[PDB]
Design a protein around this nucleic acid. Sequence first.
RNA 1: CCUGUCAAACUCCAAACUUACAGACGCUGUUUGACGCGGGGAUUCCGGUGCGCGGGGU
RNA 2: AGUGCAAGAGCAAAAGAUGACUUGACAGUGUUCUUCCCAACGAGGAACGCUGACGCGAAAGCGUGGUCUAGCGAACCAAUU
RNA 3: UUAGGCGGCCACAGCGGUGGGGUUGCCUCCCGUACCCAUCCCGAACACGGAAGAUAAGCCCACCAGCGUUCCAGGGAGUACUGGAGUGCGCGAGCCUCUGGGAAAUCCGGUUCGCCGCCACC
Lengths: 154, 160, 140, 186, 95
Amino acid sequence: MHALVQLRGEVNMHTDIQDTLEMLNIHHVNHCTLVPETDAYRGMVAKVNDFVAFGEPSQETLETVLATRAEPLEGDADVDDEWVAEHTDYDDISGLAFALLSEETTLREQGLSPTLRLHPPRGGHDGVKHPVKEGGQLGKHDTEGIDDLLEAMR
Amino acid sequence: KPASMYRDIDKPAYTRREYITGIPGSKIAQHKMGRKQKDADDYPVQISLIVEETVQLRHGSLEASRLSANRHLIKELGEEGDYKMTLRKFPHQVLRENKDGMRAAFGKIVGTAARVQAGEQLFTAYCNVEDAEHVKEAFRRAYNKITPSCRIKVERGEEL
Amino acid sequence: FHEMREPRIEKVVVHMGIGHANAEDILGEITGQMPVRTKAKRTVGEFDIREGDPIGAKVTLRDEMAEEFLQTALPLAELATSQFDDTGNFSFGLDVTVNLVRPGYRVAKRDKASRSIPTKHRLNPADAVAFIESTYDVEV
Amino acid sequence: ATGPRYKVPMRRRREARTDYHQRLRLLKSGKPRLVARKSNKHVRAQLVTLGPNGDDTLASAHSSDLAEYGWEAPTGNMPSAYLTGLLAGLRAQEAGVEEAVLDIGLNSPTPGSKVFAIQEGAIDAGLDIPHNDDVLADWQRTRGAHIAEYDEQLEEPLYSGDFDAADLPEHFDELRETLLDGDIEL
Amino acid sequence: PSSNGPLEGTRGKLKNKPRDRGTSPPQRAVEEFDDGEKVHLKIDPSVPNGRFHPRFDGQTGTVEGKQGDAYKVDIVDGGKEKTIIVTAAHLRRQE
RNA sequence: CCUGUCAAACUCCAAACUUACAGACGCUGUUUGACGCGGGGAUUCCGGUGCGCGGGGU
RNA sequence: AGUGCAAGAGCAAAAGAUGACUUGACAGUGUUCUUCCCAACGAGGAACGCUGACGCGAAAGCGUGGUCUAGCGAACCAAUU
RNA sequence: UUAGGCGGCCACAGCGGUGGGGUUGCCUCCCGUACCCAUCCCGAACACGGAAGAUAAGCCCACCAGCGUUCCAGGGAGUACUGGAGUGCGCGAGCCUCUGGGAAAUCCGGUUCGCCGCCACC
Ligand SMILES: [Cl-]
Ligand SMILES: [Cl-]
Ligand SMILES: [Mg+2]
Ligand SMILES: [Mg+2]
Ligand SMILES: [Mg+2]
Ligand SMILES: [Mg+2]
Ligand SMILES: [Mg+2]
Ligand SMILES: [Mg+2]
Ligand SMILES: [Mg+2]
Ligand SMILES: [Mg+2]
Ligand code: NA
Ligand code: NA
Ligand code: NA
Ligand code: NA
Ligand code: NA
Ligand SMILES: [Sr+2]
Ligand SMILES: [Sr+2]
Ligand SMILES: [Sr+2]
Ligand SMILES: [Sr+2]
Ligand SMILES: [Sr+2]
Ligand SMILES: [Sr+2]
Ligand SMILES: [Sr+2]
């Protein structure tokens, strides 16, 4: 399970690439989705590789992100342990977080929005013109490297 | 005409003589120089002139560089000296010129050029150990008459 | 082994390449059967502009009709070594050509499942000379 | 053979066994082929339909399995040819085959030949095959009367092995009678 | 194009690779397809008759009946539906 | 035999890629009716630039 | 190689050659594609059927002209069946 | 299939080569023209009739790789080329990094001297 974050806008970007982002339920910049690691989903992230930031998050970081940014399918309601308990098949945020990572369920399946609408990176990111290997913030990241981004976007 | 008009590889490969008529003859007199009866492996030293940029060299530039290179070897090693130089590239690319404004712009045939890629050998001379510094000077004169910058690389010689 | 390997006469082709007919009568008298006309292809400048026109005649002789001809045909010419084919046939001359081959040539002349005769079963120039020499004449 | 550009014919053409142009025209009907083949000593007649991995033979008949019914005479002639065709046609009726098209292969369409006799036999057995009555031999040559009139020019016997002296074309009639009977073990 | 003929720009698709030269095998020219079956459209360069317009090479149509010996195959060219008359010689079964 | 070069109108080879159909995932539609069909009204048929691939031309 | 003529393409027990027989270069009416990719548009064209009548062949079958892609023309008026 | 018939794929099956195999059996070559049929001339072929002889052809069986072909290993090569991205480099033609694909020639070493279907048959 990878976590996609759009870091580059829609303007001047190819339609077939923009449409893939909308299929992956990510419509705005700084929006995040939890995509499983299958062959079909792999082709989709490879196509968006240059306008996105992805990688597998740590159980600890995914938990923090879900607490602060996860929303219901409809509504303002905070997704805390008590919310999870009353609507989901789990007990707390940790139970959900484990299942998402082990690819047992999805956010939509549990009545949560497929999108985690994050805040802009605190202290800024490494740049949108270069990939990770070149010192930028695009493409595949380390499990520690994606966490720095997702935690900075609390 | 200047080489600026024909040096770059921008037009398609136009070599098909069955569709092209009135092509001027090659100004290149010889391709095999020196002692063409003796073999290349009979010489201890093999030095080549390597073209650094991907270019298109005209038959006149090919003749001028070959003539100013072999003439130095005829001067320093004698007319029947112990060397053999080879020009491995041949002028295949047929060149045009629009010589009426831009209407019916397809030009008439004016010459021929050789497509040489970067890193390739234009000239290759095979000599002995004592005549090694004379050939490096023949290439110094030969590179001044073509379009790109060049390398004088020794491919068979640990005698330094 | 030797019985199915010993050569025989397949066909004796007697042809007269004239160029423009009257010579059909002399063949039917010397051979014993009916002759056939010979046509030509490609326009030649020696006043030979017509394609489908009789230029000569030929007769192909089989079995008895072939041997009863060669008894009187062979003494009429001096046979040489350079007068032989690589396949073991010979022509002398009025042209007289004798096609010699081994007992299983039908395999290459039939319709159903025909195959070409292997190099080993094909007649040699030397193996041909010996067969004719063994029948009333000299070689060299 | 010579290089990469070289074109080697199809296997059955290389072998000179199948005429692929005549095969296409034959298969265009949709009916099974009455494969009429002949050897020097024997005569074969197959009823072939088309299949996914190759040809399917639904009912065959060789002139060798003709002796099983009462044939003491040779197997590569006109009476044998008809009877092999009749035997093939009868085995075809018990398989469910009603109609067929004559395949002669690389044999010639010569008027009154053994392959046309194979066809006459199969039609007589109850099979619907497109034919031409005046291209088939007259009823007496099919009987083997031409062989009896050759044995009249005796002096020296025609047959080596003892079957008879002056030949019996009545054996054809004795066998056609045995095959027309429904009791027979096919 | 320089001319708008049916065989324009068809040097490659209507030519056989040297080893696929000569007369084609009959098995595929007699092949029986049923209605509803998905078929691939590819012209056999060795077979002259029963061809379709070379623009439709590579189409995977659906057999919707027949006209004589030839088949009526339904395709969708761009967004427009067309019915193609084609013989078995130029058709291959999908899968 | 050896040795030196080429091809828009060459090819024993041969991608990336584009493309038909089908399944799957995704997304979308069944009160926001998609897909499709029928009808009313247009405007429009001087375009331009970047990038990639071009063809002509110094 | 040849296959009437550009070019590209097809063809070898043939689509080429020979020979012989023959007039399907036939009448009528369609389906479809093309003309006009997608996507509307005439004439023209082609593939593929049916009805009628024929030719050849043992027969399956082939012949809606020439192996395929050029060789074409509205309304009005006249002539013709 | 102790030799056959009809095929599918249509060279992995081609080209070339070595060895083996046939009393009432099979396939052939073979013997032979009264007839059906036949040759613009030839029972050569086609067609028909038949077994005195034969395993030399063909064919069937086993096998050889020199040529041609198929595929595989390794090397060439993640090279050549390339879909997506870049306030990366170069006066420029052009190049480079990241991401996703990925050859061809040739050399060396294996493979390949057909596979499969239906039918009939000591
Ligand atoms: Cl046969
Ligand atoms: Cl069409
Ligand atoms: Mg909401
Ligand atoms: Mg700040
Ligand atoms: Mg920045
Ligand atoms: Mg092309
Ligand atoms: Mg008028
Ligand atoms: Mg008039
Ligand atoms: Mg033997
Ligand atoms: Mg710059
Ligand atoms: Na002017
Ligand atoms: Na073919
Ligand atoms: Na029309
Ligand atoms: Na004549
Ligand atoms: Na043998
Ligand atoms: Sr240019
Ligand atoms: Sr220079
Ligand atoms: Sr394209
Ligand atoms: Sr035609
Ligand atoms: Sr004979
Ligand atoms: Sr400059
Ligand atoms: Sr790979």
